UniProtKB/Swiss-Prot annotation, chain A:
Protein name per its UniProtKB record: Spike protein S2
Full protein segment contained here: 728 to 969 of 1273
UniProt-annotated glycosylation sites, renumbered to this chain: N74
Annotated phenotype, changing N213K: In strain: Omicron/BA.1, Omicron/BA.2, Omicron/BA.2.12.1, Omicron/BA.2.75, Omicron/BA.4, Omicron/BA.5, Omicron/BQ.1.1, Omicron/XBB.1.5, Omicron/EG.5.1
Organism: Severe acute respiratory syndrome coronavirus 2
Lineage: Viruses, Riboviria, Orthornavirae, Pisuviricota, Pisoniviricetes
Effect of N100K: In strain: Omicron/BA.1
Impact after mutating D69Y: In strain: 19B/501Y, Omicron/BA.1, Omicron/BA.2, Omicron/BA.2.12.1, Omicron/BA.2.75, Omicron/BA.4, Omicron/BA.5, Omicron/BQ.1.1, Omicron/XBB.1.5, Omicron/EG.5.1
Gene name per UniProt: S
Site-annotated residues for Cleavage: R87, S88
Curated annotation (Swiss-Prot), chain B:
Effect of H15Y: In strain: Gamma/P.1, 19B/501T, 19B/501Y, Omicron/BA.1, Omicron/BA.2, Omicron/BA.2.12.1, Omicron/BA.2.75, Omicron/BA.4, Omicron/BA.5, Omicron/BQ.1.1, Omicron/XBB.1.5, Omicron/EG.5.1
Protein name: Spike glycoprotein
Practical and industrial applications: Main component of the anti-COVID vaccine Chadox1/AZD1222/AstraZeneca; in which the human tPA leader sequence is added in N-terminus to enhance protein secretion.
Post-translational modification (record): The cytoplasmic Cys-rich domain is palmitoylated. Palmitoylated spike proteins drive the formation of localized ordered cholesterol and sphingo-lipid-rich lipid nanodomains in the early Golgi, where viral budding occurs.
Interval of the full protein contained in this chain: 641 to 727 of 1273
Length: 213, 75, 226, 49
């Protein structure tokens, strides 16, 4: 999970919705509302703070060049699809597996905005290596990056190039497998579904209580 | 002088084409700020100066000079 | 210069902290939040909670016990429930702080006591070191981070042939200044004459993608010839 | 959520923006790299190990 649904609740409508005889009795409870409404509001901004610090780790928003000569590595599934939301294929499935004074504030960073991050964080990752976290992103051809990345687990670069085509193919076929796994079972996204569900349950339980004597 | 946005009806702000950094967040990607003679503008928050990287089979970008910086992280 | 670079760097923090107190929001809120919690907790004393008045000493001077018991009970169930609310807030909030404390300890454990290797754990960039600094109810770190500054394109290829065989770089990547090929480390340019002393053998030229014909110098031959 | 979010950020921070060396932090194996993908209220990583 990253963020929750930025729920906000007015005590006065919830507790005395349109009743002057009621809200007078609520004032005798002093400041319970103002803190509750403040509490959820503090939650709300925290979620936007969550999404900013998760995704917006990058200052400049990179975009991939028209050529995809990624040393044989096939990313066409993970890059955003220019012909659709400029979102990717694999993620497109992911958005498809998911589903009184009570208002829902919208998220500050919109879904289209969210994608651009994930396009950028992906873009500098591809063409520039790790250097785009430190500062100015430096273009590096992708097959070079694995030679570093293999150098990052104690297998010298000579593994990659002497095995370049297969490893690309292995990763390429690897990429397709998630597409099937995500498409096959909706339980692949169990955690996020839970994040929706208890949130759905919390509200429903919150709503039903209005029926109790 | 009214701007309609996905979050609601924002009055008092001129809608602006130009994108700038977010100063105050509004909702649905719209941010407001006070700029020049001066007034309150609302705009599609810029995700920053867009960039692009000269990807190639056959080139590297290796820095020739650096910085020693210091930032403050507070907990 | 690096020494001076660090020296001038530090003085900048002096100004930024001195110029604005907004830099210390993450501590000020903590003081603010607790002050808010206390003020809310204090103000609750004035709420009548449905009791005829919100002063215990009144009610006691106002009613005999068999009827005062009812009114005081209204405050007690309310005021306790407010205190109960405040404690639950603190426990949750204290967990947040303790979460930062453990993060603070780890940064002190891994960024002061040593150089962390976790990207964006000790500030943006290839981390160098940190200088912990006291603060009210919190801590402040002065991370010292290496950030590349001045950059130049070069043309690369993962290898070179010398005799029809493949060379990779032991440390660095292959570059050219347009006429002559150089191999250099990865984050601050310095070319070097590509000799066998920097390069290692692995395979031949028929499998590598991008390899380019080149000449590798052997320091040994001049010694034998001379 | 927040602890996961900070865990999420650290995973982008360390595992995307660089190459992690924490065994069993970027999926089972000697980690290579990762590609984040947006998702509702959460994020999906593709840890290539
Ligand atoms: C990456 O793989 C995809 C397959 O998933 C390639 O796209 C296919 O391209 C062929 C040739 O034009 C078409 O016949 C298929 O219909 C395409 N399928 C899909 C799903 O796109 C794509 O060309 C590959 N990219 C690279 C750079 O190799
Ligand atoms: C690329 O670097 C080489 C290495 O120095 C340069 O070749 C030398 O150039 C100087 C003149 O500045 C001559 O005195 C040397 O004799 C050259 N070395 C050799 C082995 O011939 C070359 O000029 C540089 N070229 C560019 C375009 O940067
Ligand atoms: C590197 O140079 C060698 C020359 O020593 C090239 O070998 C020749 O390649 C051509 C085809 O390109 C053949 O027709 C010749 O017969 C080869 N010569 C010998 C002596 O076998 C080699 O192709 C070059 N490779 C690169 C990548 O530049
Ligand atoms: C932006 O420019 C378009 C013309 O390209 C115009 O129709 C629109 O009104 C402009 N909006 C603002 C806020 O300037
Ligand atoms: C880096 O830039 C400084 C000026 O900021 C200059 O004095 C120094 O010589 C440069 N370093 C190198 C290695 O050229
Ligand atoms: C590298 O070349 C591209 C154009 O091919 C240019 O946009 C970029 O600024 C160059 N970078 C450097 C460091 O010269
Ligand atoms: C990289 O792409 C160019 C196309 O501009 C091609 O000519 C070149 O052969 C490619 N590099 C390798 C190593 O295949």
């Amino acid at each position: 999970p990253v963020s929750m649904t930025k729920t906000s609740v007015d005590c006065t409508m919830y507790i005395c919705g349109d009743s002057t005889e009621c809200s007078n009795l609520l004032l005798q409870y002093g400041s319970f509302c103002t803190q509750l409404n403040r509490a959820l509001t503090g939650i709300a901004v925290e979620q936007d703070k969550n999404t900013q610090e998760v995704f917006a780790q990058v200052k400049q928003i990179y975009k991939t060049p028209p050529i995809k000569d990624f040393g044989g590595f096939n990313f066409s599934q993970i890059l955003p699809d220019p012909s659709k939301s400029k979102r990717s294929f694999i993620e497109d499935l992911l958005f498809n597996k998911v589903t009184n004074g009570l208002t829902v504030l919208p998220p500050l960073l919109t879904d289209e905005m969210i994608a651009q991050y994930t396009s950028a964080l992906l873009a500098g990752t591809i063409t520039s290596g790790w250097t785009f976290g430190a500062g100015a992103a430096l273009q590096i051809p992708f097959a070079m990056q694995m030679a570093y990345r293999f150098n990052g687990i104690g297998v010298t670069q000579n593994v990659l190039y002497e095995n370049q085509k297969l490893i690309a193919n292995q990763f390429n076929s690897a990429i397709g497998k998630i597409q099937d796994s995500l498409s096959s079972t909706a339980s692949a996204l169990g955690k996020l579904q839970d994040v929706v569900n208890q949130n759905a349950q919390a509200l429903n339980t919150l709503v039903k209580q209005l029926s109790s004597n | 002088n009214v701007f309609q946005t996905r979050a609601g009806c924002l009055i008092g702000a001129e809608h602006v084409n130009n994108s700038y950094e977010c100063d105050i967040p509004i909702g649905a990607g719209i941010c407001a700020s006070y700029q020049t003679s001066q007034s309150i503008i609302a705009y599609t928050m810029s995700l920053g100066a867009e960039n692009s990287v000269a990807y190639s089979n056959n080139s590297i970008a290796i820095p020739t000079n650096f910085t020693i910086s210091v930032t403050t992280e507070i907990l | 210069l690096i020494a001076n670079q660090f020296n001038s760097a530090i003085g900048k923090i002096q100004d930024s902290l001195s110029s604005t107190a907004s830099a210390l929001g993450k501590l000020q809120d903590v003081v603010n939040q607790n002050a808010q919690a206390l003020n809310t907790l204090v103000k609750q004393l004035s709420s009548n909670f449905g009791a005829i008045s919100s002063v215990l000493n009144d009610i006691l001077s106002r009613l005999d016990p068999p009827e005062a018991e009812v009114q005081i009970d209204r405050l007690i169930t309310g005021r306790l429930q407010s205190l109960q609310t405040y404690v639950t807030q603190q426990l949750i909030r204290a967990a947040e702080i303790r979460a930062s404390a453990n993060l603070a300890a780890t940064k002190m454990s891994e960024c002061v006591l040593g150089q962390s290797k976790r990207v964006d754990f000790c500030g943006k960039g290839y981390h160098l070191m940190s200088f912990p600094q006291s603060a009210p109810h919190g801590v402040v770190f002065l991370h010292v981070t290496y950030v590349p500054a001045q950059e130049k394109n070069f043309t690369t290829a993962p290898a070179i042939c010398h005799d029809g065989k493949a060379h990779f770089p032991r440390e660095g990547v292959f570059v050219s200044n347009g006429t002559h090929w150089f191999v250099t480390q990865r984050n601050f340019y310095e070319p070097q004459i590509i000799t066998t002393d920097n390069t290692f053998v692995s395979g031949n030229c028929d499998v590598v993608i991008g390899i380019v014909n080149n000449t590798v110098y052997d320091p040994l031959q001049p010694e034998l010839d001379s």
